[PDB]
Ligand binder design. Sequence first.
Ligand SMILES: *[C@@H]1O[C@H](CO)[C@@H](O)[C@H](O)[C@H]1NC(C)=O
Lengths: 48, 48
Amino acid sequence: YFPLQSYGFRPTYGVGHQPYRVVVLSFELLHAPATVCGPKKSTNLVKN
Amino acid sequence: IDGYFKIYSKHTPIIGRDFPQGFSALEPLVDLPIGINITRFQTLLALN
Ligand SMILES: *[C@@H]1O[C@H](CO)[C@@H](O)[C@H](O)[C@H]1NC(C)=O
């Protein structure tokens, strides 16, 4: 048997058979210095 | 370093012919966090 099979997606198909775009986010643990962080910045200088 | 590769540099003008006797500090330029094994060192020469 052929290992690969065509999906044959059709709009008339049900929700379970409808195509779904899936993206998997993988996070690498701390083994090297961190290169990706989140954006954080607020407030002002407010002196004196 | 284990987590960084610190690089320090400085540009000076000639006073004399070669290796003048004087003091000049070395300002850092960039610290690449590559963290790899480094044992040998070889330089390059430009050929025109
Ligand atoms: C990196 O590899 C070099 C070359 O074999 C070795 O001398 C050095 O100990 C290694 N360093 C680490 C942290 O594994």
